[PDB]
Amino acid sequence: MKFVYKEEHPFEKRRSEGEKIRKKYPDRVPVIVEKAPKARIGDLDKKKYLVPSDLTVGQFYFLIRKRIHLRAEDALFFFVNNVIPPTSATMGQLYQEHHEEDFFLYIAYSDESVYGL
């Protein structure tokens, strides 16, 4: 999966901020959230989120919906490394396994059940 944040902010500066932020905020994981390519739903103003590690994916859905113009007829799916993480996983679990080496977790959203369609 490809994200604008990575293209705009170069690695060693991201990894810089990841290390910093992960040490100030206990029990809060840093995650970047971008609209997927080809997705047709509301854009998200802010990308950079600190999320309680014990917060479920299920709940993270609720919090992101709250922040985009989403009609009821619109579907919404998260993607981590091209795969939909289950609603039962914790943002903590998700960070542990799939955090990249800048210490960030990258999640894309879309209205299509398959990334980038």
Binding site: L50, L55, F60
Partner: peptide, 21 residues
Amino acid sequence: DDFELLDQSELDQIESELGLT
């Protein structure tokens, strides 16, 4: 700070209202 902190407090009452156990 460019980071937005999400807190469960937003959800907490909702979950009660919808009947979470």
